[PDB]
Design a protein around this ligand. Structure first.
Ligand SMILES: *[C@@](O)([C@H](CC(C)C)NC(=O)[C@H](CO)NC(=O)CCCCC(C)C)[C@@](C)(O)CO
Ligand SMILES: *[C@@](O)([C@H](CC(C)C)NC(=O)[C@H](CO)NC(=O)CCCCC(C)C)[C@@](C)(O)CO
Ligand SMILES: [Cl-]
Ligand SMILES: [Cl-]
Ligand SMILES: [Cl-]
Ligand SMILES: [Cl-]
Ligand SMILES: [Cl-]
Ligand SMILES: [Cl-]
Ligand SMILES: [Cl-]
Ligand SMILES: [Cl-]
Ligand SMILES: [Cl-]
Ligand SMILES: [Cl-]
Ligand SMILES: [Cl-]
Ligand SMILES: [Cl-]
Ligand SMILES: [Cl-]
Ligand SMILES: [Cl-]
Ligand SMILES: [Cl-]
Ligand SMILES: [Cl-]
Ligand SMILES: [Cl-]
Ligand SMILES: [Cl-]
Ligand SMILES: [Cl-]
Ligand SMILES: [Cl-]
Ligand SMILES: [K+]
Ligand SMILES: [K+]
Ligand SMILES: [Mg+2]
Lengths: 220, 248, 233, 230, 202, 234, 244, 239
């Protein structure tokens, strides 16, 4: 996994690759790693896949209950607190490593959240087995107050660095762009990897497979 | 606090349980509900109380509930209380299936729920559930079956029975017309309509005002169906044709 | 209606006073302590010739050296008797010695006022026990008879009657008792008194009798041994 | 500790009078109306709003449960807030397991089950509210009522609170199956006008609508627009 | 990490490096390790980032509530006591070496150490974190009784710079805070502003 | 009336009838007397026998080497409270390796017995105690009540016709501090004897004695062992 | 019906035949036992709370007699009714606010704090074993979007936001005075907020106050921290009023 | 009837069980507190119901912390229970926060515990009122009083029990703001003697305690010789 985020002039850009692995085998070529928190807040997940899914779903749900009650758009700090307090309580046993970004009444905010419950509020962050490749791109090229398209270029460059240099990362680049005015969930943003084509045809005709027993059960 | 406790689970001086007796008065006022056992199946027929013009019609019935693959029930009395009990019936039936990997036999499901009702009359200081139930089913031990239970946690098996409004009158009509060992689903259907026609004496009988469900066996499988309104009106027609024959 | 732990204006617990009145609905039992042992005698109160008289057990062994006679609501006595049995066995287990009659009586008597409806476990005791008990036995103090009632008050007695005719029987006991009385005299005296107070004609099947002596363990009299003692009486 | 005995019990005639009396609290509440159109549902209610001093926007009687389900009531407002909170929680619990918004009828069944509890459980009275619940799922609108007993019913149109008997007959002589949502909003407001007393403004009625796009309250400006004809 | 605080007449100076590490990767190069607990009470955090954040949040909550109830600013000693209670009670489950410093109207500028294990001691100045090993000598030779605020700031910045040069586990920028009756003044020393001492070449 | 069945119900006069009723349990018990000198604390108790053939109820109980009690009221409540006292004394020796001071034990009783007077469905303790003890502050006599109040006493009597005993004790209390042990016990017996009907006298069957002091652990005297104290009431 | 009663419906919170809760009604009478009245008013720039301060006893330390309470730095309140109940409700509010900030990372909105206290009060109207609190809470604070807020909750668990409101003995009369005054005002909003509050209280009581007979609390958009006026500050307002 | 439970309001909004508990305090003999320039002084009219009791028996003055005294009226077992609650609260505060509990905070915490016993059928209200007194250089002299409803206020002078009003009118005559603890003890004794009804209740002990600059902020019994001088002054002033 390579996940990343940046604060740009008017918002947040989040990024992620789409590979999931089991050991050193690709289990999913098109996993979605950028998760809905609220209409103005999204969260990339790295680490144990069930833990990132379930943790983000739970917090999203509790935040919807919160916003239904308040009648207001949620704050990024609130998602951050809820996540970190739960992860701390579980002592690192919930293997969710998160990049949380959104835009609230106080503007854009980006946090990295670790499994043991520490968080860092920063203008750019990376996580996953590809995170140092992605961070090299950011250290070399980040500038404050980038325009939307510059920020999008930078995030996809960073994800690409992880895709091509980390065996844990691959397939497509997804981005999520969040501003006061707009949410662009770009899945896929880029498809830099493509399966090669098949050269021979193995279209096996009926009767190729020998059959011992057959039962047809008709349905309504 | 002893001053406010109405003491729902104690005996009266004649060995009676007043809350149980009072719950039974509630049931007597609810929609009439009958069950009739035949050779090839079992049926439930119930008076609907949800009959205002502006109601919407969203479920497949009002008072008939599927309990598991092989069983259904109908209820007379407090509706919200019925929803609690029928939810509990479904749970009991799935707990059995989980444990034994076969369907719960009908009498065992009835008894399990009756033990819950009984507990509410003996301890805990709560009001009993204000519900009587008719249960129809098939199992591999006794085939087609009909049971009745009430808020005392008592039950019995029946060839035919009635709960709710005008029960006593309904049972007399069944006593006289029911042929032990000789009923079919088609004649049990005729008899059900005859009985409801007499016991809904406020006033003229209509398909909008009754609900009928049948339980049968087809190709080694139990089929539980709620009759469509077309079929109910046809049976009402046949009963009215039949009463035209009654003299000459 | 008031709670079960309500005091009356005279400083008594209503429930306990009422439980004491239930003892008067019981059959009469008698205990006598002599230097040669204690005896316990009880009226069975047979209500049908179809009833098996041996199924009425109002005298029970607690341990080899201790018996117990009961009167009042007999079903209530079962948990008290079982507590007495368990306690004497615990004491044996722990200390490798027999428990004194006084100590057994004390252990049972500490159950007495443990009732009530807002201190205790989900379904703890709702009321006192409608039972009175005579514990008769022998320990290193010699022979001993103790009485206990539903207040949890217990006391040693030289002779005591309990149940329906206990006034009556207690008066005859004052008349006949003496400190140097033999066990055989005590046995006869208690059957003479039961004979007076019983509604039915006394015989060898409608009474029970037991002894405990320094030589000898708890002993229930057989039909044949009762008949022997009944001849003179 | 808590009283562990029921405060609702059967009378000799077989009535649960505490539930009847809870229904009288509902009957004396402010009027509410729900109409199921062909393409949506409208919920409308009168504010028991005296003073100009009230900030009308500060609390709402018409409330979202989910993106696609909303509620109104007649009876006791604070009891209603309990049920709103539990309904929202029930909806989220469903979503976490099934990853699908709760069907309207499933939400009504679970909420009605909570109301039933308060008719039997120890040391509590029943809720003094009836709920009207609207939703859209399986491409189709739903309108339900849930009463203080925990009984629920599906309606094409209904009225509750003060003067409800009349409101039901007003709707009986006025609703049709093929009616559109915009027409339905109009007849809902007319139903409230039948028993209003005060002169209607956009500040003392509240309107919610439900369609394929979801559940939402109408804004003061939208209600003002519908009020110009009325 | 290197953390430090120093008392002067009327207040305190606090300082920290800005490095968060996992092994020898720098996960944050501009960490803020000086966290406000109340208007004039800060803590400097070292050890586990998760643990010290959780504990600082909990103490902020406790102290805030306490302060509203009493209707008075809290004592620096109270803040330190709350840290100590939590760090001592949970000493087997936390990795936290804390300095609490601040100002209150009753006792003025105060510095408390709560090292791992959860003891508490007041000090004229305190140092902590793994980088502190390398500056014990420096601070012992350079400390003078009666330093002004401006001297405490220089003393702190110098000590931290030296630690940061030698300790792989410390670095980045120097964050400083001065606390007094008039309020809190924060600043960052970066790049060329960090005090500089030659590498001793031949 | 509506105010007398629950210990949680204040009457409109600011009283709690259930507590007052519990105090009647002590007034109807058989009398007991407690008194002290500079060096000893003594308890004297009349024992009631049900019939002529019953032993006579125990009235005096051992608590610890330095503490004993005399009881009046419900016997089962007396045992429950005595067991609490015993346990508090054992705890103090276990923890601190020294006797529990008598005034601290009495405080613990006050605190324990107050609790059920304030909770619904509980009742007061229906027992009154006289407590004799000796510690670093010398001899003590304390009295405890069903109200959970307690009193530090020069001497005291509780139970039936105890007013007479109290009148004797007031009359002679200026003598107690300087009494030898024999004189002090004699005074206890004469006070108790004032509680009796004119016909009847103190005997070895109906008197029980408890003594503790500087040189003497708490000791109970019954039956033939009370005779030395009864002879020479001359 | 019309004041009918069955069973225990005047002793515990069960429904009367008309669907009333008499025990809740009686908790409102308990609010007036104290004999005091409070007023609160909001404008575009501030919100204010004014209440009577009665110190009949000379031996009281009058600095300890107050009905104004800080809930958080930015939320103030005035309590009306039974004093010990009021203090308990203030403690609860303080706890709820602090807990909100800890869990969610931002200050509790005034409307949410008022709702939470109202929801807690609701429980006492549905559960039989405890009474309602015989007190009423008025909260003031600045909301970053909506400006100054005034919220009130009561023993029935009702709550609402207000342009202005009152509590206690002269609540109804205060409501009429405030109603009549706002109708006159353009865009139905108060402008001279501290003067409206004090004038209202002084009219409905007929008193003409000394600066020691009232307490005043404020929050403003420029200065959102809850502040209690001193005697001299209050006196300046009383003198400025007296002179037109 | 509307007066059997603290969980029931009467139709006029009263809680009669709390009022009845107040009547128990008002049947009790009188306790007073007076704050002055440099401390707080307590006095109690302690009725001696039997000559068989020891001097000192049934104290109505308690140390609840080293710096805090408590003076009580009403049902004495209830008051002792409250003193234990006050002690536990002071102890817990020191353990958690690391310094001596401020008087006002202690008063407020115990008052909330009293208040909790005024809401429920499960328990009854405390039949006692009590005063809390302290002194320190930072906080000065403080005197609080708490009643069975759980109301808590601060005072210059305070009286509880049956001659409360007569005591208050005598307390109002003192310029206590300018007097010292040594001056005030004599005036406390004087006032107790004035309000004591020597016909109706025959015998009493005067109980005195203080906390102030002169005790270094420790709550202490007034020494015996100073008490006797104050009594002698009070008695002769009665004349
Ligand atoms: C990612 O961290 C990736 C993120 C995950 C949210 C897809 N993690 C995984 O693929 C982990 C790494 O162990 N694998 C699993 O949790 C097993 C479940 C995968 C099978 C599918 C049912 C999801 C990277 C960098 O670890 C990917 O290599
Ligand atoms: C500091 O002690 C520093 C202080 C901390 C409060 C920022 N501690 C750390 O950086 C610690 C390791 O000691 N790191 C963490 O807690 C890990 C946080 C993120 C974990 C994932 C990246 C796996 C110094 C001296 O230790 C800093 O080197
Ligand atoms: Cl945070
Ligand atoms: Cl199934
Ligand atoms: Cl099945
Ligand atoms: Cl008997
Ligand atoms: Cl209960
Ligand atoms: Cl909610
Ligand atoms: Cl949803
Ligand atoms: Cl909405
Ligand atoms: Cl950190
Ligand atoms: Cl350390
Ligand atoms: Cl450290
Ligand atoms: Cl470190
Ligand atoms: Cl760094
Ligand atoms: Cl006795
Ligand atoms: Cl007894
Ligand atoms: Cl007493
Ligand atoms: Cl007595
Ligand atoms: Cl916080
Ligand atoms: Cl204005
Ligand atoms: Cl008083
Ligand atoms: K370094
Ligand atoms: K209630
Ligand atoms: Mg850890």
């Amino acid at each position: 996994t390579t996940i990343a985020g940046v604060v740009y002039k008017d918002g947040i850009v989040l990024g992620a690759d789409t590979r999931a692995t089991e050991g050193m085998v690709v289990a999913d070529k098109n996993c979605s790693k950028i998760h809905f928190i609220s209409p103005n807040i999204y969260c990339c997940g790295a680490g144990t896949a069930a833990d990132t899914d379930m943790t983000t779903q739970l917090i999203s749900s509790n935040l919807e209950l919160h916003s239904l009650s308040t009648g207001r758009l949620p704050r990024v700090v609130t998602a951050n607190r809820m996540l970190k307090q739960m992860l701390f309580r579980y002592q690192g046993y919930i293997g969710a490593a998160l990049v949380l970004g959104g835009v609230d009444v106080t503007g854009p905010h980006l946090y990295s959240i670790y499994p043991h419950g520490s968080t860092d509020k920063l203008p750019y962050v990376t996580m996953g087995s590809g995170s140092l490749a992605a961070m090299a791109v950011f250290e070399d090229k980040f500038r404050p107050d980038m325009e939307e398209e510059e920020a999008k270029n930078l995030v996809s460059e960073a994800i690409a660095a992880g895709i091509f240099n980390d065996l844990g990362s691959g397939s497509n680049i997804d981005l999520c762009v969040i501003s006061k005015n707009k949410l662009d969930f770009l899945r896929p943003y880029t498809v830099p990897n493509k399966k090669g084509t098949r050269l021979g045809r193995y279209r096996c005709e009926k009767g190729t497979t020998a059959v011992l027993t057959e039962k047809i059960t008709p349905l309504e | 606090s002893r001053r406010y406790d109405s003491r729902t689970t104690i005996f009266s001086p004649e060995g009676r349980l007043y809350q149980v007796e009072y719950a039974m008065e509630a049931i007597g006022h609810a929609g009439t509900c009958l069950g009739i056992l035949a050779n090839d199946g079992v049926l439930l027929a119930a008076e609907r109380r949800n009959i205002h013009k502006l109601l919407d019609e969203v479920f497949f019935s009002e008072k008939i509930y599927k309990l598991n693959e092989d069983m259904a029930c109908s209820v007379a009395g407090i509706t919200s209380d019925a929803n609690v009990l029928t939810n509990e019936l479904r749970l009991i039936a799935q707990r059995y299936l989980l444990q034994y990997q076969e369907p719960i036999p009908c009498e065992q499901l009835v008894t399990a729920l009756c033990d819950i009702k009984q507990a509410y009359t003996q301890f805990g200081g709560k009001r009993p559930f204000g519900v009587s139930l008719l249960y129809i089913g098939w199992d591999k031990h006794y085939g087609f079956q009909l049971y009745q239970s009430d808020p005392s946690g008592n039950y019995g098996g029946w060839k035919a029975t009635c709960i709710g409004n005008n029960s006593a009158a309904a049972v007399s009509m069944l006593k006289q017309d029911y042929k032990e060992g000789e009923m079919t689903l088609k004649s049990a259907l005729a008899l059900a309509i005859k009985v409801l026609n007499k016991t809904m004496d406020v006033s003229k009988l209509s398909a909008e005002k009754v609900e009928i469900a049948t339980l049968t066996r087809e190709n080694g499988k139990t089929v539980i169906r709620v009759l469509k309104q077309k079929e109910v009106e046809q049976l009402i027609k046949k009963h009215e044709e039949e009463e035209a024959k009654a003299e000459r | 209606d008031r709670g079960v732990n309500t005091f009356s204006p005279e400083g008594r617990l209503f429930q306990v006073e009422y439980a004491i009145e239930a003892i008067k609905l019981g059959s009469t039992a008698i205990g006598i302590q002599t230097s040669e042992g204690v005896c316990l005698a009880v009226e069975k109160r047979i209500t049908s010739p179809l009833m098996e008289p041996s199924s009425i057990e109002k005298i029970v062994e607690i341990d080899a050296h201790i018996g117990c006679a009961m009167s009042g609501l007999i079903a209530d006595a079962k948990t008290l008797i079982d507590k007495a049995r368990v306690e004497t066995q615990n004491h044996w287990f722990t200390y490798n010695e027999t428990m004194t009659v006084e100590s057994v009586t004390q252990a049972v008597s500490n159950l007495a006022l443990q009732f009530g409806e807002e201190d205790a476990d989900p379904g703890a005791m709702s009321r006192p026990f409608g039972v009175a008990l005579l514990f008769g036995g022998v320990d290193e103090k010699g022979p001993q008879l103790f009485h206990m009632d539903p207040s949890g008050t217990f006391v040693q007695c030289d002779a005591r009657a309990i149940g329906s005719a206990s006034e009556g029987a207690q008066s005859s006991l004052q008349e006949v008792y003496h400190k140097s009385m033999t066990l055989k005299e005590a046995i006869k005296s208690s059957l003479i008194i039961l004979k007076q107070v019983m509604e039915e004609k006394l015989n060898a099947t409608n009474i029970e009798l037991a002894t405990v002596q320094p030589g000898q363990n708890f002993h229930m009299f057989t039909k044949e041994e009762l008949e022997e003692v009944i001849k003179d009486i | 500790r808590g009283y562990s005995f029921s405060l609702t019990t059967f009378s000799p005639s077989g009535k649960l009078v505490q539930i009847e009396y809870a229904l009288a609290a509902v009957a004396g509440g402010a009027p509410s109306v729900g109409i199921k159109a062909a393409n949506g549902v409208v919920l409308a209610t009168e504010k028991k709003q005296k003073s100009i001093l009230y900030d009308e926007r500060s609390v709402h009687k018409v409330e979202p449960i989910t993106k696609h389900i909303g509620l109104v009531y007649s009876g006791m407002g604070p009891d209603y807030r309990v049920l709103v909170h539990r309904a929202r929680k029930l909806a989220q619990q469903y979503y976490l397991v099934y990853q699908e918004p709760i069907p309207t009828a499933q939400l009504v069944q679970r909420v009605a089950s909570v109301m039933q509890e308060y008719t039997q459980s120890g040391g509590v009275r029943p809720f003094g509210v009836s709920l009207l619940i609207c939703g859209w799922n399986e491409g189709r609108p739903y309108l339900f009522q849930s009463d203080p007993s925990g009984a629920y019913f599906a309606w094409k149109a209904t009225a509750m609170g003060k003067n409800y008997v009349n409101g039901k007959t007003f709707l009986e002589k006025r609703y049709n199956e093929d009616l559109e949502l915009e027409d339905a909003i109009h007849t809902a407001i007319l139903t409230l006008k039948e028993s209003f007393e005060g002169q209607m403004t956009e500040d003392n009625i509240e309107v919610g609508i439900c369609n394929e796009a979801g559940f939402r309250r109408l804004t003061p400006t939208e209600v003002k627009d519908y009020l110009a004809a009325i | 990490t290197t953390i430090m605080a120093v008392q002067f007449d009327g207040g305190v100076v606090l300082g920290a490096d800005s490095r968060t590490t996992t092994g020898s990767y720098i996960a944050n190069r501009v960490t803020d390790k000086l966290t406000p607990i109340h208007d004039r009470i800060f803590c400097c955090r070292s050890g586990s980032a998760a643990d010290t954040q959780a504990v600082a949040d909990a103490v902020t909550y406790q102290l805030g509530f306490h302060s509203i109830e009493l209707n008075e600013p809290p004592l620096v000693h109270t803040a330190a006591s709350l840290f100590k209670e939590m760090c001592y009670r949970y000493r087997e489950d936390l990795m936290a070496g804390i300095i609490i410093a601040g100002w209150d109207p009753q006792e003025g500028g105060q510095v408390y150490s709560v090292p791992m294990g959860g003891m508490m001691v007041r000090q004229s100045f305190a140092i902590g974190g793994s980088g502190s090993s390398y500056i014990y000598g420096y601070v012992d030779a350079t400390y003078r009784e009666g330093m002004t605020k401006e001297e405490c700031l220089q003393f702190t910045a110098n000590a931290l710079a030296l630690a940061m040069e030698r300790d792989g586990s410390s670095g980045g920028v120097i964050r400083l805070a001065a606390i007094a009756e008039s309020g809190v003044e924060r600043q960052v020393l970066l790049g060329d502003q960090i005090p500089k001492f030659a590498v001793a070449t031949l | 009336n509506q105010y007398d069945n629950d210990v949680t119900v204040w009457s409109p006069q600011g009283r709690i009838h259930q507590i007052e009723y519990a105090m009647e349990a002590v007034k109807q018990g058989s009398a007991t007397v407690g008194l002290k000198s500079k060096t000893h604390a003594v308890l004297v108790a009349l024992k009631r026998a049900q019939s002529e053939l019953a032993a006579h109820q125990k009235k005096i109980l051992h608590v610890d080497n330095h503490i004993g009690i005399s009881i009046a009221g419900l016997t089962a409540d007396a045992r429950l409270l005595c067991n609490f006292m015993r346990q508090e004394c054992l705890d103090s020796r276990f923890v601190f390796d020294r006797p529990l001071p008598v005034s601290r034990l009495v405080s613990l009783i006050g605190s324990k017995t107050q609790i059920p007077t304030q909770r619904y469905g509980r009742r007061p303790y229906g027992v009154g105690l006289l407590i004799a003890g000796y510690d670093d502050m010398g001899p003590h006599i304390f009295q405890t009540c069903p109200s959970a109040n307690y009193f530090d006493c020069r001497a005291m009597s509780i139970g039936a016709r105890s007013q007479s005993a109290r009148t004797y004790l007031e009359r002679h209390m200026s003598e107690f501090m300087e009494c030898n042990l024999n004189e002090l016990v004699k005074h206890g017996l004469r006070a108790l004897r004032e509680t009796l009907p004119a016909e009847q006298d103190l005997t070895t069957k109906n008197v029980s004695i408890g003594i503790v002091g500087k040189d003497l652990e708490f000791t109970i005297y019954d039956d033939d062992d009370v005779s030395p104290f009864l002879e020479g009431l001359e | 019906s019309r004041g009918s009663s069955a069973g225990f419906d005047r002793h515990i919170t069960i429904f009367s035949p008309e669907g009333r809760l008499y025990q809740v009604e009686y908790a409102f009478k308990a609010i007036n036992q104290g004999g005091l009245t409070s007023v609160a008013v909001r404008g575009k720039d501030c919100a204010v709370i004014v209440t009577q301060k009665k110190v009949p006893d000379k031996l009281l330390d009058s600095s300890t007699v107050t009905h104004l309470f800080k809930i958080t730095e930015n939320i103030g309140c005035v309590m009306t009714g039974m004093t010990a109940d009021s203090r308990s409700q203030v403690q609860r509010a303080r706890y709820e606010a602090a807990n909100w900030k800890y869990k969610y990372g931002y200050e509790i909105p005034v409307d949410m704090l008022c709702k939470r206290i109202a929801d807690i009060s609701q429980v006492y109207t549905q559960n039989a074993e405890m009474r309602p609190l015989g007190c009423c809470m008025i909260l003031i604070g600045i909301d970053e979007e909506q400006g100054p807020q005034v919220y009130k909750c009561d023993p029935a668990g009702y709550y609402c936001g207000f342009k202005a409101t009152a509590a206690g003995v002269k609540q109804t009369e205060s409501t009429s005075f405030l109603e009549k005054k706002v109708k006159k005002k353009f865009d139905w909003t108060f402008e001279q907020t501290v003067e409206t509050a004090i004038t209202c209280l002084s009219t409905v009581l007929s008193i003409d106050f000394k600066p020691s007979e009232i307490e005043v609390g404020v929050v403003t958009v420029e200065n959102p921290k809850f502040r209690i006026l001193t005697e001299a500050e209050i006196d300046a307002h009383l003198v400025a009023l007296a002179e037109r | 009837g509307y007066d059997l439970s603290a969980s029931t309001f009467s139709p006029d909004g009263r809680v009669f069980q709390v009022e009845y508990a107040m009547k128990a305090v008002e049947n009790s003999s009188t306790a007073i507190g007076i704050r002055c320039k440099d401390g707080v002084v307590f006095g109690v009219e302690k009725l001696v119901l039997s000559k068989l009791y020891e001097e000192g028996s049934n104290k109505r003055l308690f140390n609840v912390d080293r710096h805090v005294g408590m003076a009580v009226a009403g049902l004495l077992a209830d008051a002792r229970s409250l003193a234990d609650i006050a002690r536990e609260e002071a102890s817990n505060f020191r353990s958690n926060f690391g310094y001596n509990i401020p008087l006002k905070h202690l008063a407020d915490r115990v008052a909330m515990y009293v208040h909790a016993y005024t809401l429920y059928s499960a328990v009854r209200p405390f039949g006692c009122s009590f005063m809390l007194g302290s002194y320190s250089v930072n906080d000065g002299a403080q005197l609080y009083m708490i009643d069975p409803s759980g109301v808590s206020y601060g005072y210059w002078g305070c009286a509880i029990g049956k001659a409360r009003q007569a005591a208050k009118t005598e307390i109002e005559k003192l310029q206590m703001k300018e007097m010292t603890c040594r001056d005030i003890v004599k005036e406390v004794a004087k006032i107790i003697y004035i309000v004591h009804d020597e016909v109706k209740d025959k015998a009493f002990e005067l109980e005195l305690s203080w906390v102030g600059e002169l005790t270094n902020g420790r709550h202490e019994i007034v020494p015996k010789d100073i008490r006797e001088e104050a009594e002698k002054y009070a008695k002769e002033s009665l004349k």
